[PDB]
Amino acid sequence: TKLFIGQVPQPYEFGRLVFNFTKLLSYFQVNTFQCQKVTPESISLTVDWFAYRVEDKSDLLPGSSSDLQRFNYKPTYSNPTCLISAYTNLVGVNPTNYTTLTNCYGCVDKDPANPWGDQICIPEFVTEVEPGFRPKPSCARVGLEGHISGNDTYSAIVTNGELDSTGDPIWRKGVALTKQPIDSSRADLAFFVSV
Amino acid sequence: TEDEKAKEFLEKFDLEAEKLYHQSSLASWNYNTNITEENVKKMNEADREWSTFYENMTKIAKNYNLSQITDDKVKRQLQALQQENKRLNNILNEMSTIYSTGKVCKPNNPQQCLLLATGLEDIMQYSKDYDERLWAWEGWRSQVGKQLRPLYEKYVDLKNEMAREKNYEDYGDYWRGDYETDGKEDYAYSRNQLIDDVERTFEEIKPLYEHLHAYVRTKLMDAYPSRISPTGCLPAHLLGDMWGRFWTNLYDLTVPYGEKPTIDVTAAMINQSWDAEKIFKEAEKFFMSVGLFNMTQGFWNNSMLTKPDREVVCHPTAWDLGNNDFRIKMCTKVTMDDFLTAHHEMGHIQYDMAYAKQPFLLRNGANEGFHEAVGEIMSLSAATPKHLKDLGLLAQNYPEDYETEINFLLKQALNIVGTLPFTYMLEKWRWMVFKGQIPKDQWTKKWWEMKRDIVGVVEPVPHDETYCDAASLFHVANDYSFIRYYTRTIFQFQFQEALCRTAQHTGPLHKCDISNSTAAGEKLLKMLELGKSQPWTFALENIVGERKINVRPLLDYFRPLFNWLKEQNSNSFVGWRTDWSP
Ligand SMILES: *[C@@H]1O[C@H](CO)[C@@H](O[C@@H]2O[C@H](CO)[C@@H](O[C@@H]3O[C@H](CO)[C@@H](O)[C@H](O)[C@@H]3O)[C@H](O)[C@H]2NC(C)=O)[C@H](O)[C@H]1NC(C)=O
Ligand SMILES: *[C@@H]1O[C@H](CO)[C@@H](O[C@@H]2O[C@H](CO)[C@@H](O)[C@H](O)[C@H]2NC(C)=O)[C@H](O)[C@H]1NC(C)=O
Ligand SMILES: *[C@@H]1O[C@H](CO)[C@@H](O)[C@H](O)[C@H]1NC(C)=O
Ligand SMILES: *[C@@H]1O[C@H](CO)[C@@H](O)[C@H](O)[C@H]1NC(C)=O
Ligand SMILES: *[C@@H]1O[C@H](CO)[C@@H](O)[C@H](O)[C@H]1NC(C)=O
Ligand SMILES: *[C@@H]1O[C@H](CO)[C@@H](O)[C@H](O)[C@H]1NC(C)=O
Ligand SMILES: *[C@@H]1O[C@H](CO)[C@@H](O)[C@H](O)[C@H]1NC(C)=O
Ligand SMILES: *[C@@H]1O[C@H](CO)[C@@H](O)[C@H](O)[C@H]1NC(C)=O
Ligand SMILES: *[C@@H]1O[C@H](CO)[C@@H](O)[C@H](O)[C@H]1NC(C)=O
């Protein structure tokens, strides 16, 4: 039940924990239950989970081309894996809104003499999430800021503790889009369950 | 009924032609990998026999009525054969000699003179002294270029007479015939169509070149204070080259991020105890993984992959001896350039093997730019960071860096983009000269007007109609066509994009590796197997997806650099004025 306690993380900062399915189904109301390389009746185990709307559920499905699986979270699913998409009232606390990274790409310094100065950002230098890993911290931080700025589509150039081959900061330009909920009294969650 | 005669003729031709070809090629190989007086004699007599055979069967082929041949492949084989001389040979031999033995003498000591390959090339490559560079530049053209004038003039007149005898408008029209094909609907390609396509693609490149030109200009202004105008053309002698063909040597002056070194795995191969045999074996598995041919037992026996310890020619070449006999001649070192070259040269072998099943006369590339373009694309793939990483040469956790990508792309642009206006302008000038659009007494005048308008380069010294700058280049003095370099570059990128699309690569095009991609290999092979049996437009479509020439893939390849340059030039003039000169 721990994953339903406190708040619910956004796609770019998905929660992960490692350890009765029927009991879980008594906490939330499942809309979609699909499995890849495993029978749902059969489902160490690990769960990757985050807030995500039901209406845009399509993005959660394997093989789909989307921003979610490009910049936020992509399931490699090398182990047998199941996807559960469900809604529930955590009152944990329900999400106020849903923030997703829509883009992130690398920047180089305009003036080589100053690694901390003005940057030139190149759209072609796309930084996409690696399956199973979280987004880079210069990408995820934009998502975190976008989730609170108030702009429904926030953009920013940030660096966050990651260094290049010389020891200088890595800067990346990110774009985050915030979507307002239709049902304001429920949380929409996505759960990726692997053996 | 003549369709049948033509067939038995070609059958007999092939039986004798392959025998004579093989022995001729073997003699040449033996010379190049030994070099003796005995071997040069054997080579010379072997070449003689083939030549007399070929000419005798040319005369027979020309007695056939091509218009009544039904089988297209028979028609093309007949064409392979079917398609003032003393005076012209004298002019051509003298021109070549003058270029080869050309030297520039010092003004304070006429007894001490430098030759192109013994010192003048090193001045143009390494010198940072405005006046030393100018001496070598002007000296070459004054001493050599002014000798080739009366010879180039006679050359042009004699060549036009030849071309017209063969029912061409001029010698330029003759050369453009290398792109002419027959075919249904729009597969056919006209000689004058090349002109439209070359000019059409050029106009789409200009914006990229103008920004690259402006960037280089601001860097040279610092290197040579008060010598270069911020809104003017670049002085010809400051481009790091005797002719300005490439901007490669300016990298040390233009490098965006000088503290951000490129990837070099020389040390890795040395520590891991690599050698020539290892390098070629790694190249072989690359081609096998994409889905092409492995090397034969003969290849691994009679090739020269190392310098012997004889007198040999170490210049890397791919040989097709005949009768399924393939070899590579290359004095391989453990560096990085030879590593990538091994892929280039083996790429040639892959093509040669692919069409080994074609009729003798059709065993060649579909177009003059296809054979080389294939080599280049295979080489590029093997140079990617992920390939080097998977080979165990680049650190598995090697840190990512965006500045090094900009450094890489610019270096590529200096060699690839900065040369296209040169090829375009040079060939255009010659075409106009052959047509008669440029008067005999306005050759120099137009050379420099066109160069200033098209390339953005200005003469350091006033020249009159006693100079010939075009003929100061190897290809012009030695009667070679030049356009092949223009079309090769464009095809190279069309091929790479299509294969990276087939391989389902998502990301920057400059970071694409086609390894472990049988689909890309199958698509490539389909084109390679055709040889000259089909129009190059057909062969092109089979690999690109379209039968037209398209420069866009080139512009997409360098797009990340274009965006960078645009911002760098925010406070700079872009383009140039031609009213300024030094
Ligand atoms: C998505 O939901 C979040 C909350 O979970 C919204 O964040 C809230 O946005 C408001 C308006 O900007 C913040 O109030 C402002 O705070 C600043 C100080 O930082 C103050 O100067 C302003 O006058 C105003 O009071 C509020 O603090 C912030 N909530 C939190 C916890 O930080 C976000 O705006 C929503 N996004 C969209 C598109 O609706
Ligand atoms: C390089 O060429 C020389 C000939 O100039 C070759 O020497 C001959 O070798 C044959 C055996 O194959 C002898 O029968 C001849 O008498 C040799 N002639 C001379 C003048 O020595 C030499 O073998 C060749 N080297 C290679 C590697 O092929
Ligand atoms: C916020 O939105 C406005 C209006 O579109 C835009 O001009 C501004 O740049 C945005 N700020 C950020 C950080 O995205
Ligand atoms: C040319 O080929 C014909 C084939 O009929 C042959 O008779 C003739 O002798 C050949 N001429 C030479 C110089 O080889
Ligand atoms: C033979 O060649 C002539 C051209 O010299 C051509 O006019 C004629 O039609 C050809 N014969 C046939 C059957 O095509
Ligand atoms: C490779 O480098 C290591 C140092 O990291 C050295 O100890 C080793 O001897 C080197 N091996 C070779 C073949 O140079
Ligand atoms: C390479 O080609 C030879 C041809 O004799 C063949 O016997 C061998 O099995 C091939 N190896 C691979 C890996 O294809
Ligand atoms: C290659 O050289 C070896 C020498 O060990 C020999 O046994 C083999 O027959 C040769 N193969 C060919 C194709 O020449
Ligand atoms: C291709 O895959 C093999 C493993 O099957 C790997 O060893 C090799 O490095 C790969 N080549 C690439 C991705 O360049």
Numbering used by the authors:
A (entry chain B): 386 to 404, 410 to 433, 440 to 487, 491 to 594
B (entry chain A): 21 to 103, 110 to 335, 338 to 610
The authors write:
Receptor usage determines host tropism and transmission of coronaviruses.
Notably, two Pteronotus bat ACE2s (P.dav and P.par) but not the additional two Pipistrellus bat orthologs tested (P.pip and P.kuh) were functional receptors, underscoring the importance of specific sequence determinants over phylogenetic relationships of the bat hosts. Interestingly, ACE2 glycans can play contrasting roles in host range determination of ACE2-using merbecoviruses.
